[PDB]
Design an enzyme around this catalytic site. Structure first.
Site, PDB file in Angstrom:
ATOM      1  CG  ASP A   9      -7.955   9.256   0.332  1.00  0.00           C
ATOM      2  OD1 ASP A   9      -8.270   8.366   1.172  1.00  0.00           O
ATOM      3  OD2 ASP A   9      -7.192  10.216   0.613  1.00  0.00           O
ATOM      4  CD  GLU A 176      -6.921   4.357   2.907  1.00  0.00           C
ATOM      5  OE1 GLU A 176      -6.080   4.543   3.804  1.00  0.00           O
ATOM      6  OE2 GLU A 176      -8.136   4.420   3.132  1.00  0.00           O
ATOM      7  CG  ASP A 199      -1.482   6.872   5.010  1.00  0.00           C
ATOM      8  OD1 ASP A 199      -1.919   7.832   5.710  1.00  0.00           O
ATOM      9  OD2 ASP A 199      -2.147   6.360   4.077  1.00  0.00           O
TER      10      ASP A 199
END
Ligand SMILES: Nc1ncnc2c1ncn2[C@@H]1O[C@H](COP(=O)(O)OP(=O)(O)OP(=O)(O)O)[C@@H](O)[C@H]1O
Length: 381
Positions: A9, A176, A199
């Site tokens: 990430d 993501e 998110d």
């Protein structure tokens, strides 16, 4: 010939790397003991290049030579309207070079270098690579690296190039929110489900509607706000504690930047503490003019200072549902991503928006994207 492949990430503010070892995803901690690493780079007067916590913790009145937020610039041209806007708020120098936004810093002793945004991010990816290799006890050559779902061709390619520079062959780019869904095993499920990904990180807020059908993910719509995250919650609390210190003494701490920067570090620590507890201690020695700093924040004061910002996150969610022809009832799965969704208030606000439906629980929201990339990486050997 791909060895152990790493899931990364690559965050605007904080990055995470995981890996599949002995049948299990392992999120790896850095040489500072942290499972997340700031997407920060700094260049000392002596010439030392710092990456991560050391870059972010290292203090001076030299904002000009500490680089962060390169994800706002990556894969973009100099003349991109977003780039023009963003550089107004960035303390380091950004110049036109090769049609792109290059970062200009003093590398030590007045020596100037320019770095492409993808060169800055390769430094961060080099950090994650070191973190994984230190834990695995071997070199790493291959990565699965995530990007936001709205990322276009040049942004995706530039993320691959950062990898190349960092010595990683980025085998797969994954969106993501898909990687978060994957971390919760939501691609296993039979049938067609509607997945909402909320998110909220340190600098950006992203909402994504995904559809899953027998292991196949489709991004149906995206929304959010590129300048809303944990950092903006920090600013609200700093303003409260700067205007508390003026109307207490008479002074102004904004007249000295080094104090400001220490207050930031501590306000941030308290904010996190307040996801567990109801008060925190903010304490910094010889804060401003030798005079000392000891103050306390309550959970409820934090919420009151930020309530309008918390509530704003719901409008993008409504928008995603609108744009996808769905209503709240058509959501089978709610997924919370980002360190800011650790905030009790945020979680309360999502669950009431969804009329009491519980979201997926179990993976550190902080870690879920790296985790899901580690699931894909695991299979890839
Ligand atoms: N326990 C906690 N309670 C409250 N906030 C937290 C907690 N842990 C981390 N945070 C906040 O989350 C933010 C970082 O989010 P995250 O690690 O998801 O960053 P990121 O992946 O770079 O996201 P973005 O790209 O949106 O900035 C920081 O502002 C940090 O203060």
């Amino acid at each position: 010939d791909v060895g152990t492949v790493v899931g990364i990430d690559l965050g605007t503010t904080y990055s995470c790397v995981g890996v599949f070892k002995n049948g299990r995803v392992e999120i790896i901690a850095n040489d500072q003991g942290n499972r997340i690493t700031p997407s920060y780079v700094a260049f000392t007067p002596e010439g030392e290049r710092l990456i991560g916590d050391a870059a972010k913790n290292q203090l001076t009145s030299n904002p000009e030579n500490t680089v962060f937020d390169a994800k706002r610039l990556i894969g973009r041209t100099w003349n991109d309207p977003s780039v023009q806007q963003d550089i107004k708020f960035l303390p380091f120098k950004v110049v036109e070079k090769k049609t792109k936004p290059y970062i200009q810093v003093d590398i030590g002793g007045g020596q100037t270098k320019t770095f492409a945004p993808e060169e800055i991010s390769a430094m961060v990816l080099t950090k994650m690579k070191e973190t994984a290799e230190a834990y695995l006890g071997k070199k790493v050559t291959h990565a699965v690296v995530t990007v936001p779902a709205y990322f276009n061709d040049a942004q995706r390619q530039a993320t691959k190039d950062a990898g190349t520079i960092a010595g990683l062959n980025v085998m797969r780019i994954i969106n993501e929110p898909t990687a978060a869904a994957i971390a919760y095993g939501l691609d296993k499920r039979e049938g067609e489900k509607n997945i909402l990904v909320f998110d909220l990180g340190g600098g950006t807020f992203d909402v994504s509607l995904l559809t899953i059908d027998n292991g196949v993910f489709e991004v149906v719509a995206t929304n959010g706000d590129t300048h809303l995250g944990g950092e903006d919650f920090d600013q609200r609390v700093m303003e409260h504690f700067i205007k508390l210190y003026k109307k207490k003494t008479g002074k102004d701490v904004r007249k000295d930047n080094r104090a400001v920067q220490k207050l930031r570090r501590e306000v941030e620590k308290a904010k996190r503490a307040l996801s567990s507890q109801h008060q925190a201690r903010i304490e910094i020695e010889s804060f401003y003019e030798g005079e000392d700093f000891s103050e306390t924040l309550t959970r409820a004061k934090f919420e009151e200072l930020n309530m309008d910002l918390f509530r704003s996150t719901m409008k993008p969610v409504q928008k995603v549902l609108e744009d996808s022809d769905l209503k709240k009832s058509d959501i089978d799965e709610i997924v919370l991503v980002g360190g800011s969704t650790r905030i009790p208030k945020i979680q309360q606000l999502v669950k009431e928006f969804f009329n009491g439906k519980e979201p997926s629980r179990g993976i550190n929201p902080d870690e879920a994207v790296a985790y899901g990339a580690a699931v894909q990486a695991g299979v890839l050997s």
